[PDB]
Amino acid sequence: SPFPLTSMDKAFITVLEMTPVLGTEIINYRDGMGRVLAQDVYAKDNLPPFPASVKDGYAVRAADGPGDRFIIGESQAGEQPTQTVMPGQVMRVTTGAPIPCGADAVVQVEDTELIRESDDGTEELEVRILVQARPGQDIRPIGHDIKRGECVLAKGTHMGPSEIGLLATVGVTEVEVNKFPVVAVMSTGNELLNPEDDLLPGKIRDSNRSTLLATIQEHGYPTINLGIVGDNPDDLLNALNEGISRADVIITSGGVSMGEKDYLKQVLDIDLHAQIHFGRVFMKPGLPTTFATLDIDGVRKIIFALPGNPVSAVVTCNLFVVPALRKMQGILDPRPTIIKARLSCDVKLDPRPEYHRCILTWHHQEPLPWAQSTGNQSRLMSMRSANGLLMLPPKTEQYVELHKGEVVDVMVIGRL
Amino acid sequence: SPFPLTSMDKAFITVLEMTPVLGTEIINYRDGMGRVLAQDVYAKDNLPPFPASVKDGYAVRAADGPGDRFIIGESQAGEQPTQTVMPGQVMRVTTGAPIPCGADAVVQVEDTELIRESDDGTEELEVRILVQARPGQDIRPIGHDIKRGECVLAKGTHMGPSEIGLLATVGVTEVEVNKFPVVAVMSTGNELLNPEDDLLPGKIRDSNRSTLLATIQEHGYPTINLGIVGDNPDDLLNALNEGISRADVIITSGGVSMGEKDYLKQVLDIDLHAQIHFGRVFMKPGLPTTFATLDIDGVRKIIFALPGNPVSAVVTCNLFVVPALRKMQGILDPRPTIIKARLSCDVKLDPRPEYHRCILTWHHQEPLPWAQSTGNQSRLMSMRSANGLLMLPPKTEQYVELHKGEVVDVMVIGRL
Numbered sequence A, B: 001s002p003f004p005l006t007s008m009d010k011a012f013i014t015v016l017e018m019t020p021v022l023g024t025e026i027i028n029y030r031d032g033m034g035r036v037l038a039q040d041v042y043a044k045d046n047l048p049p050f051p052a053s054v055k056d057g058y059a060v061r062a063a064d065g066p067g068d069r070f071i072i073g074e075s076q077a078g079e080q081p082t083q084t085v086m087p088g089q090v091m092r093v094t095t096g097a098p099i100p101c102g103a104d105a106v107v108q109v110e111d112t113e114l115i116r117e118s119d120d121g122t123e124e125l126e127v128r129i130l131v132q133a134r135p136g137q138d139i140r141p142i143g144h145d146i147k148r149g150e151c152v153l154a155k156g157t158h159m160g161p162s163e164i165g166l167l168a169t170v171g172v173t174e175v176e177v178n179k180f181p182v183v184a185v186m187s188t189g190n191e192l193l194n195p196e197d198d199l200l201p202g203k204i205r206d207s208n209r210s211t212l213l214a215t216i217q218e219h220g221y222p223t224i225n226l227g228i229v230g231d232n233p234d235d236l237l238n239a240l241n242e243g244i245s246r247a248d249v250i251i252t253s254g255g256v257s258m259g260e261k262d263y264l265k266q267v268l269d270i271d272l273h274a275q276i277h278f279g280r281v282f283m284k285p286g287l288p289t290t291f292a293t294l295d296i297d298g299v300r301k302i303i304f305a306l307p308g309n310p311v312s313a314v315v316t317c318n319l320f321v322v323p324a325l326r327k328m329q330g331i332l333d334p335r336p337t338i339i340k341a342r343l344s345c346d347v348k349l350d351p352r353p354e355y356h357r358c359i360l361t362w363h364h365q366e367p368l369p370w371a372q373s374t375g376n377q378s379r380l381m382s383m384r385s386a387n388g389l390l391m392l393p394p395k396t397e398q399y400v401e402l403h404k405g406e407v408v409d410v411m412v413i414g415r416l
Helices: A008-018 A161-170 A208-218 A233-246 A263-271 A310-328 A379-383 B008-018 B161-170 B208-218 B233-246 B263-271 B310-328 B379-383
Strands: A024-028 A057-060 A067-075 A089-093 A105-108 A112-117 A124-129 A151-153 A174-178 A183-188 A223-229 A249-253 A275-278 A290-296 A299-306 A338-343 A354-361 A370-373 A388-392 A407-412 B024-028 B057-060 B067-075 B089-093 B105-108 B112-117 B124-129 B151-153 B174-178 B183-188 B223-229 B249-253 B275-278 B290-296 B299-306 B338-343 B354-361 B370-373 B388-392 B407-412
Touching (some): A057 A067, A057 A124, A151 A161, A161 B208, A183 A208, A208 A249, A233 A263, A263 A275, A263 A290, A263 A299, A299 A310, A310 A354, A310 A388, A338 A388, B008 B275, B008 B310, B057 B067, B089 B124, B183 B208, B208 B223, B233 B263, B249 B310, B263 B275, B263 B290, B310 B354
Parallel strands (some): A067 A089, A183 A249, A249 A299, A338 A370, B067 B089, B183 B223, B183 B249, B249 B299, B338 B370
Antiparallel strands (some): A024 A174, A057 A089, A057 A105, A067 A124, A112 A124, A275 A290, A338 A407, A354 A370, A354 A388, B057 B105, B067 B124, B112 B124, B275 B290, B338 B407, B354 B370, B354 B388, B388 B407
């Protein structure tokens, strides 16, 4: 130390290379949102499991052709019919009802005309079939949608609502998935008070813990608030030991610049015996960002020591922490989604790659969204929550500034 | 009935026009994610509340200019200094520390050279200042970032992690927000079994409840599972009455096509005394979709009767239900985000506007994402969860088909 400047590219790959994938657990399928399957899932039944009508109408014998027919009964959803349709007969069917024995096609009600009904009008007795049915018409045969023994979901699938619905369909209500990481967050600094506190001389409220915890919670991971820790080695070691005991990932903010600090980087190295992989990153903001791993008893803990600056802490959380968490919970390609957008304002480039929260908006019929950096002046736009992180290239002897309208990379960090 | 075909545009505006905005409640700021503020929030303190150093270095008198200086002490984060810097003196400062009386500028450590330190090396005693400081240099004056009395968040703001961090910063830990809707979901149909059940003759498992509940939960709203209800008027009325009692929004699936059904539309009208605003929509899938409101005791309940077809139920939930829920929880412009994408395959157009789940992907440096419809054939792509809903125009005497590469509208429905 001062630790080497690590390039942004190397820092990012290092995080993903060194981060473990968590082990597996069995869950109820209803709790599956955002989980990654650690097993293939097979169907144990056909869908449909009986031949089913696609339409409201009549189950017919195609070989009878068009003509006038006696209605012998009705096949209704949920009940296996017991009658057999004979020549000159049909059975009323509704969508989803089983096709009765004897019938080999369905004719939809619009292709029929009713001839006779009961005196009280509640039962149809005779119908005119106006068309020549093709065999199998408007019937879903057994297993048309899913066959018994078919693999319907592969291991590695990241589940959303439709996958949960598919598990329900096939009756696989307990599934093996990767665990979610438990993430502990602490803040360090003698100037910090809790949000609930009135100010005292020399002090400010801690906002990083809240911002970071919210960011992690937004992605669905369980969290632990480890509070504010004093900037001294003893208290820091104790807090880190608690985090290691209680969590898979520890995030700290503060204590990583040069000066009064570097207690933190020193404590990680000498007292905790952690391996610090990088301690400075060539990026703006985020220069003092630190990443370490600790191996205990065949388990790898990961530690992120983020800058105390509140803006820097939230940018680095989205760039480094979130992808790591995604890898830990089993997502095969944990990289963030990066989209192309048009800059709303001119921006000056820095020798470091630069990152800034922004709002992405689509304008009428224009194919690319516009990216407007936050914090810098309309009323409505100044109220929206950031959903992007602008990713600006470092300046070069040639490119020193980017202009309004130019296409840039933006990392998605909020629901769009 | 058969109810008039309502255009997709009219159906959508009707839903948003008729849906109420819920009342307000006070919450702890930590629970604020996704909430909409129903109050303006003001700062009661300045940030910083004392003049603060931007840098590690020395607090100086600019009028002394460059030269050799006695270091009289250190100002550290969290402690108000008690000494006054006199001519020819400086005080060590770290980033965030208060500027002592007497000093009017900070010179960063890189613009200095140390002359003398204590015998044990732990305390700096004399330093050479190499530059002419400008008055106020590297100091954040009181209120530079936030002024006492400043409105930092406006009513109508939809909160994310950064807004939660801002509440923590200003110490406003309880805030008035709109309530979230409680959404009850039931399925109807005599053919339906619970996911936990083995199949019986004539029956299939209910997947809609699971898919719909997951979709609603993904957006963060509380839900109630009302189970499977028999397709008969008595049981339907009882279930609806339970939903009305327990929830703000009731979603049913099944019972809305012509035939064995229309018990549901009849029960809503005659027994529940609800106002059905539309009962068919000119769309594919989703034709039988029904929307109703019920006013009791100055409270408006909303009821969506979605198609029983599992694909139709999930498309209609994203098009109609989600925007309604967004309006109920106070979001000022509850419309979904619609983006432009390139079709991955040729598609035939229908006389109805058509909607289909898809996966959006960005390719290397290409500015527009590609949209690939689900369900229709690579391995990896067939595993991803849908994040889009393709919105296809109705066919016209001129446009009958859309080709691979053509730009189409896609509604975002998943984290991208």
